Design a protein around this ligand. Structure first.
Ligand SMILES: Cc1cc2nc3c(=O)[nH]c(=O)nc-3n(C[C@H](O)[C@H](O)[C@H](O)COP(=O)(O)OP(=O)(O)OC[C@H]3O[C@@H](n4cnc5c(N)ncnc54)[C@H](O)[C@@H]3O)c2cc1C
Ligand SMILES: Cc1cc2nc3c(=O)[nH]c(=O)nc-3n(C[C@H](O)[C@H](O)[C@H](O)COP(=O)(O)OP(=O)(O)OC[C@H]3O[C@@H](n4cnc5c(N)ncnc54)[C@H](O)[C@@H]3O)c2cc1C
Ligand SMILES: COc1ccc2c(C)cc(=O)n(C)c2c1OC
Ligand SMILES: COc1ccc2c(C)cc(=O)n(C)c2c1OC
Ligand SMILES: [Zn+2]
Ligand SMILES: [Zn+2]
Lengths: 230, 230
């Protein structure tokens, strides 16, 4: 009701549990009067590879390609590929960025990892200095909404997988806090394929219900202690 | 003697520090008489997206697409896409898989995340049962050779980045251990771009020297305690 939300969504099947979670977020944030945009990466055939195709201008060093140096220069010159600048405009305008995905290998699907690698370039999301609490997306909120195959109990300190917060570190800390975001507590929807039809319904509703009051939430302290203890 | 090694390499520029690390690994392992294969993912234009193109012929469930179910059934029915099956043949023959990459957002570059997501499928790399210590690639060694932009000091427990071990978790534990690899100690080449000249010529030589005795190494204990503990 005076806020813009971007949902960066990474699932191939609109009928999936991820699809239901993205759709309930759109329904409830639209109901509240928020402005909502969804980047549906598979439907966009979003390019995940970091390549020299991402810079259209004269390179700074055409003899030895360095993706970080070339994209930083490209951002400043306005010569990055348009798919990257299209996503940067959505991020720049958003007050909250929700990432909706299934956990692949304790991380994001590669199509979403390529969104982070290509969209969050130096100059746009961070600079040196200008990272962690001084990152360039300061003032914005981010939230990971993850689904898993593993049950909640597998994702505890003494379960097989270790605590769920452990796999969050490179994403919440190394990526989102690095860029200046404040991080809202993650939404983790555990083992929906194993769960009953009513259980999956309960998890979709629980997310809808959380979104009713998302603007009242405060972010986590995105530190080593929150993630690991000690 | 006799041993086979697969190097999965993820850098765009053959003249890079990563390139030099890959090329010294080829040179030294070939000198020792080992069988060496290199999957040069950018040069291959390797597909990182997990999509229904990864299954050939008719889908187990063509109304509701589930990548993990479809690719498990496809592996069993020898109907995965040829780029995937080509890589699984390389991994199946290998005794040691070396991943050579620059760290992107505390993790692998998306093109390499896509190799993990699409080659390490259920039935090939893991199953019920057959994970962690009993993963299906048990008997094989895996090793991360990672370059960073951050310095070793930045990568300490109280440093801005946290201990390196913290970002290694989803890769060493959640991916390589999970599939049954014994994980050799990562090779972490901290902050090459800012180093001399020498120092660099030298981190290459620590790696070539390490590789002289790689078959004598014992695997790390791939535990939460190794990654996070004291
Ligand atoms: C490469 C790969 C790597 C993986 N790595 C990991 C990992 O590291 N750790 C881990 O724990 N897991 C991992 N997984 C498993 C993956 O995380 C889960 O399969 C995924 O999280 C489940 O989400 P989904 O949307 O695909 O579930 P779905 O299979 O779509 O959802 C379960 C069921 O919910 C139903 N559903 C959809 N909407 C609703 C609704 N509104 N109400 C009721 N039911 C509904 C669907 O019809 C479906 O039958 C991996 C999978 C792959 C393919
Ligand atoms: C999206 C993105 C995300 C990133 N995220 C992170 C992150 O999370 N954390 C982090 O720490 N860093 C991050 N980085 C930085 C990245 O990890 C480093 O830039 C990379 O690791 C440096 O290795 P390189 O091969 O690319 O270096 P190069 O620049 O290719 O090498 C450094 C220098 O050594 C030269 N060289 C080549 N071969 C040799 C040799 N034989 N002997 C001596 N010198 C040689 C090179 O040409 C160059 O001058 C990120 C970069 C990008 C683009
Ligand atoms: C491809 O599927 C995968 C891949 C990896 C995992 C991991 C690392 C932990 C886990 O609990 N589950 C369920 C997984 C899974 O689901 C079967
Ligand atoms: C895109 O580039 C990036 C992206 C991320 C990092 C992080 C998380 C820590 C770090 O120390 N450095 C240097 C980084 C970097 O450097 C260029
Ligand atoms: Zn943090
Ligand atoms: Zn482990």
């Amino acid at each position: 009701a005076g806020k813009k939300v971007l949902i960066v969504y990474a699932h191939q099947e609109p009928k999936s549990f991820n699809g239901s979670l993205k759709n309930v977020a759109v329904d409830e944030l639209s109901r509240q009067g928020c402005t909502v945009t969804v980047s549906d990466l598979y439907a966009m055939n979003f390019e995940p590879r970091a390549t020299d195709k991402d810079i259209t201008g004269t390179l700074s060093n055409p003899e030895v390609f360095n993706y970080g140096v070339e994209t930083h220069e490209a951002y400043k010159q306005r010569s990055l590929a348009s798919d990257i600048t299209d996503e940067q405009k959505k991020v720049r305008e958003a007050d909250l960025v929700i990432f909706q995905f299934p956990l692949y290998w304790f991380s994001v699907p590669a199509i979403l990892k390529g969104w982070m690698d290509r969209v969050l370039c130096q100059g746009f999301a961070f600079d040196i200095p200008g990272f962690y609490d001084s990152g360039l997306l300061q003032g914005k909120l981010a939230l990971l909404s993850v689904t898993t195959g593993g049950t909640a109990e597998m994702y505890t300190k003494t379960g097989v997988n270790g605590d769920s917060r452990y796999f969050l570190w490179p994403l919440q800390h190394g990526t989102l806090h690095f860029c200046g975001f404040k991080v809202l507590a993650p939404q983790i929807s555990f083992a929906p394929e194993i769960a009953s039809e009513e259980e999956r319904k309960g998890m979709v509703a629980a997310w809808s219900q959380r979104l009713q009051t998302i603007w009242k939430e405060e972010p986590i302290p995105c530190t080593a202690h929150w993630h690991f203890g000690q």
